[PDB]
Structure 1
Amino acid sequence: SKTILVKMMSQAGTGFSFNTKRSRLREKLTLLHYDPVVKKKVLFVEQKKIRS
């Protein structure tokens, strides 16, 4: 079992990306992070795969 590193972009329109380690067999991940640009919790979705 190998994990995948994916970059998540904010859904608030601001440009903010933080990488998160994810299991390969899992589907697309969607979290609730906290971007300082808007100073409020906003939805984050998986955008790109960078490292395995």
Structure 2
Amino acid sequence: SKTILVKMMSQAGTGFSFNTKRSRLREKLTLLHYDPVVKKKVLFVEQKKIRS
């Protein structure tokens, strides 16, 4: 198995990104993270695939 580095984006409409190691054979990743601009716990959904 390999893991993957994905770029995850905020749904708060604030451009904010953070990268996460995620299982390759798993589903598209979605989390509750902290967005600094809105200063809140918001939903992040993975926008992009950065490193493999």
Q: TM-score range by the shorter chain?
A: over 0.9
Q: TM-score, normalised by structure 2?
A: 0.97
What is the CA deviation profile of residues 1-52 of structure 1, one whole-angstrom value per residue up to 9, with x for unaligned ones?
Answer: 0001000010000010000000000010100000110011100001100101
Over 6 Å off, 4+ runs: none
TM-score (norm 1): 0.97
Gaps of 5+ in 2: none
